[PDB]
A paper describes a structure:
Before the onset of hydrolysis (substrate-bound state), both MHR1/2 and NUDT9-H domains are occupied by ADPR. Within NUDT9-H, the adenine group of ADPR is sandwiched by the indole group of W1264 and the phenyl group of F1372 via π–π stacking. The terminal ribose group of ADPR forms multiple hydrogen bonds with the side chains of D1330, D1426 and R1428. Three Mg2+ cofactors (Mg1, Mg2 and Mg3) are bound between the two phosphate groups of ADPR and two acidic residues on the Nudix helix, E1386 and E1390. The extensive interactions between ADPR and the NUDT9-H domain strategically anchor both termini of the ADPR molecule, exposing only its α-phosphate (Pα) to solvent and making it readily accessible for nucleophilic attack. Indeed, we observed a putative water molecule bridging Mg2 and Mg3, as previously found in the crystal structure of NUDT5. On activation by Mg2+ ions, the water molecule is deprotonated by the catalytic base D1460 located in a loop close to the Nudix helix, and is poised for nucleophilic attack on the phosphorus atom of Pα. Although both Ca2+ and Mg2+ activate the channel, the Mg2+-dependent ADPR hydrolysis of srTRPM2 is inhibited by Ca2+. This is because in the Mg2+-bound active site, the three Mg2+ cofactors are closely coordinated around the α-phosphate, likely inducing a favorable geometric distortion around the phosphorus atom for hydrolysis.
Author numbering:
A (entry chain D): 483 to 532, 546 to 723
B (entry chain D), F (entry chain C): 917 to 1061
C (entry chain A): 676 to 756, 787 to 916
D (entry chain A): 1062 to 1157
E (entry chain D): 1110 to 1157
């Protein structure tokens, strides 16, 4: 249904589909997703400010989930979304199909990290971009969800274990891709590690890895070479 | 400033890790030290009012006797035993148990606890050496930043 | 079972079976001396849940100790499980085995400190007040040893435990020393022999504190 | 041990001892009250029994699958299959 | 971005190749192939 | 001339390898020794002009106290404490902290650093025993040539 807020109404169809995946997963008994959104203490747009009809029927929108994941990573996570590029007026642009793919992939990637479905997460991680940074983000979200207040409970134990396992695996992926980069061209790998990314308030990948407490990434020879 | 060096830095991380084993040794050692100290101080100076000197006597000699400094000449002097053989020909027969108590105490602390601490240190070292190197590599960035 | 549903696994481990005179599976495993079953995380989770009683598992040593020392100031401001509620919270907190363990620890620590002070300070010409308090405390300890002895699974199981043996040595040492002093309270030699026995008493009492 | 032990500490555990002794005297001699307990229902018992039997079957299926994914068993099964494969070539060659 | 994406694809191809050269995977693939081989003898014997 | 022998030669190669661990121990030990020595020398003799004797006092007793020789009778004599209990009834109350400082110091050096050195020696020995045998076999040709 149509909403008076212009931000929610601007959202494309696939965002509503991801919202439908969150809703159906949330309606299942003892689901950690519904409990996580209730304990988040945020509004419909995900802002930490604490009508009623809008807050339950559209409680699993992508912007609100982005805000929850944003608080979960660090103090400076801020995904810049641009849903205006899916309009037909941007079709003449050459690289637009990649960005639309990458952005879409990212949103689905985050959803797959939230439900702890590793294979589908790895697949969405491969299609999109910013592979190293996304793997670090995946490791950080799974470790923080695994020690969050919303995941304590008798039925979530195996799930929690799975999260730490998956976290370690994503950390390995981030190391592996990094290693491949350092094997191919060390200067470009150093330039890549020194590159400031807009998604974490303009600071580099090693700083992101340190904030994500990724010991394996920091102990890697490529990262140590850049630090030296 | 030792942390930049590849030898001194992991050893310092290792030292903070071994502090828990040192604390474990202190908690186990505290039991024998307080027990032997109360028993030994009471046997050496009976019929005396409790004071701060009694507490200092409980703590002073039992702690320093685990490092090999045996106060046996001083203990012998305090026991008022006048014989050529040390804990013989004493005024009270109860004070002659002070070497026996001491013999059990340093058997408990030096033979058992110190060697147990050596075993915990060796095991702990083998367990956390690679983790110390990794943690040193994270602290390399911390110092650089 | 623990992989599929932890609560049903806990309920299964807590279920009394008629074939072993109405007692649970962990007790059966302990009687069968199955170390692998007892060391399993599911069994340990049930044992920890039994340890904390009707309290949250995130409670630390200091929190329960502070609540023990300050009952009316820390218990309403904690989350777990107005005479209907305060009485319910008091009966749940103080029926927990962890709280009883902490009470026994604190009690044995005071016993060690008070008895240590008694041995270090000089004996008087009559039986002192602290001596009478220690006499009441060790009779009570002796009665507690008799009470555990009667309601356990036999004399062999009780005497098998090293801490029960240490308890018998403490009670025996204190009573010999006390009767040695009480036989002739004004005799200096009796006081010296009594303190000599009580040196052994303080050594066993602190050794017993490692439990 | 600390489930069955009285709550009250050692100087004050005498009160707990005389209270239990008083209760024991009132059960053997007075008999003016009794003991109450709770007995588990047959429904929850059959639920636990069904759960335990189902998980027994699940562990055995998982255990059989895990032993068949082991390297020695896979090499052995491959070996027996290659033996059955020659039996089939003997049949094919005979028919030719 | 192009460099990082290219090396991501290269590590995944190398990773897949490394897991297929492992002993367990090779034994498993050999096992499934021998199962497919009997399927083919069943077809050959039926035709005979 | 021990290097020809199959027992003494790899052990000598092993001794030079363990010299780095000894040096690491010296660098870690130097921190506590200088800190405790400056603190202890200042507490024992206050209101005194700095001289060469002050430096010798900083270095002499803290180094030899890690080998178990406790200078407590000598420390007690220098502290001017006249009581039967040793660090009681002193002229200044500050000098009574000298056993406490000492207690922390030998806990840092003997309990922690010496046992840490034992762990480093055991690990180092297991790591470089085969390399020591190989290096001894190269030194066999060196001696032959
Ligand atoms: C398990 C432990 C407690 C073993 C027990 C051994 C104890 C009780 C023994 C060992 C050495 C003994 C002492 C040896 C010598 C003497 C001198 C004698 O003129 C009076 C008794 C006295 C002072 C003994 C008292 C008892 C004693 C302390
Ligand atoms: C192999 C080792 C453990 C042997 C054990 C040594 C024991 C049995 C020895 C070593 C030192 C001894 C004590 C030395 C001095 C005295 C004082 C004397 O007036 C009574 C006996 C007494 C108290 C001795 C009792 C026995 C003793 C404790
Ligand atoms: C099992 C252990 C803990 C108990 C050891 C027994 C102790 C309490 C008993 C056994 C023998 C006793 C000693 C026997 C003889 C004497 C000589 C007397 O002139 C003074 C007391 C003294 C020195 C006794 C002190 C207490 C003593 C050491
Ligand atoms: C973490 C470390 C520093 C623990 C701190 C404990 C220190 C500060 C304590 C432990 C022993 C203490 C000393 C014990 C006894 C005395 C005698 C008194 O008449 C004056 C203070 C003085 C000299 C104390 C000073 C403070 C002291 C040195
Ligand atoms: C298990 C082990 C670590 C117990 C620790 C022992 C500590 C607490 C003991 C051992 C030796 C003790 C010191 C011995 C002597 C003196 C001199 C006195 O005038 C003030 C207290 C002071 C300075 C003591 C302070 C406490 C002390 C440092
Ligand atoms: Mg990609
Ligand atoms: Mg008992």
């Amino acid at each position: 249904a149509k909403t008076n807020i212009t931000a929610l109404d601007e959202l494309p169809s696939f965002a509503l589909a991801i919202e439908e995946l969150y809703k159906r997963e949330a309606k299942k008994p003892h689901s950690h997703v519904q409990r996580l959104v209730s304990l988040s203490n945020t509004d419909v747009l995900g802002r930490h400010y604490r009508g009623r009809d809008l807050a339950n029927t559209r409680a699993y929108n992508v912007l609100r989930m982005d805000q929850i994941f944003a608080r979960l990573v660090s103090k400076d996570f801020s995904v810049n979304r641009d849903f205006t590029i899916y309009d037909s007026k941007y079709d003449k642009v050459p690289g637009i199909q990649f960005r639309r793919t990458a952005q879409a992939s990212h949103m689905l990637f985050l959803w797959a990290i939230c439900l702890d479905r590793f294979r589908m997460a790895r697949h969405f991680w491969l299609i999109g971009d910013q592979s190293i940074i996304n793997a670090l983000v995946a490791s950080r979200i799974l470790e923080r969800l695994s020690t969050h207040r919303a995941l304590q409970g008798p039925h979530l134990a195996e799930e929690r274990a799975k999260m730490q396992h998956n976290a370690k695996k994503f950390e390995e992926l981030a190391v592996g891709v990094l290693g491949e980069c350092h094997g191919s061209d060390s200067h470009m790998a150093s330039e890549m590690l020194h590159s400031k990314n807009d998604m974490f308030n303009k600071k580099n990948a090693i700083n992101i890895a340190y904030d994500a407490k990724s010991l394996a990434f920091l102990s890697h020879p490529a990262t140590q070479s850049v630090i030296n | 400033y030792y942390a930049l060096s590849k030898n001194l830095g992991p050893k310092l991380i290792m030292m903070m890790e071994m502090m828990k084993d040192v604390s474990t040794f202190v908690f186990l050692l505290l039991i024998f030290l307080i027990g032997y100290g109360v028993a030994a101080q009471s046997l050496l100076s009976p019929d005396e009012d409790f004071s701060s000197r009694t507490f200092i006597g409980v703590l002073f000699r039992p702690y320093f006797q685990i490092y090999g400094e045996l106060f046996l000449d001083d203990l012998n002097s305090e026991a008022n035993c006048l014989g050529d053989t040390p804990f013989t020909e004493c005024s009270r027969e109860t004070v002659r148990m002070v070497p026996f108590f001491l013999a059990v105490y340093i058997l408990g602390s030096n033979v058992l606890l110190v060697n147990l601490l050596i075993a915990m240190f060796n095991d702990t070292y083998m367990k956390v050496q690679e983790a110390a190197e990794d943690l040193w590599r994270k602290q390399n960035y911390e110092l650089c930043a | 079972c623990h992989g599929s549903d932890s609560h049903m696994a806990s309920e299964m481990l807590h279920s009394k079976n008629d074939m072993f005179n109405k007692k649970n599976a962990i007790n059966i495993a302990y009687d069968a001396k199955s170390l692998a079953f007892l060391s399993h995380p599911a069994t340990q989770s049930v044992i920890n849940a039994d340890w904390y009683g009707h309290l949250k598992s995130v409670t630390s040593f200091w929190a329960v100790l502070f609540a023990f020392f300050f009952p009316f100031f820390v218990l309403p401001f904690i989350n777990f499980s107005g005479a209907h509620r305060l009485r319910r919270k008091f009966a749940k907190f103080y029926s927990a085995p962890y709280t009883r363990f902490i009470s026994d620890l604190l009690s044995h620590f005071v016993l060690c400190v008070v008895t240590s002070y008694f041995v270090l300070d000089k004996l008087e010409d009559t039986i002192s007040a602290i001596e009478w308090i220690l006499l009441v405390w060790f009779v009570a300890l002796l009665l507690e040893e008799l009470r555990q002895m009667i309601f356990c699974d036999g004399i062999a199981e009780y005497i098998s435990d090293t801490w029960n043996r240490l308890d018998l040595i403490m009670i025996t040492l204190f009573f010999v020393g006390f009767f040695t002093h009480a036989s002739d309270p004004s005799n200096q030699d009796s006081k010296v022999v009594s303190k000599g026995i009580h040196a052994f008493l303080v050594v066993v009492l602190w050794l017993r504190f490692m439990r | 041990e600390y489930k069955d032990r009285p709550f009250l500490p050692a100087p004050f555990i005498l009160l707990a001892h005389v209270h239990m002794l008083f209760m024991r005297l009132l059960r053997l001699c007075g008999v003016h009250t009794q003991e109450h307990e709770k007995i588990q229902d047959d429904e929850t018992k059959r639920k636990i029994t069904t759960f335990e039997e189902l998980n027994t079957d699940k562990f055995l299926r998982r255990w059989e699958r895990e032993r068949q994914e082991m390297l020695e068993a896979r090499v052995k099964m491959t070996n027996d299959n290659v033996v059955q494969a020659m039996g089939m070539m003997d049949q094919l060659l005979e028919h030719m």
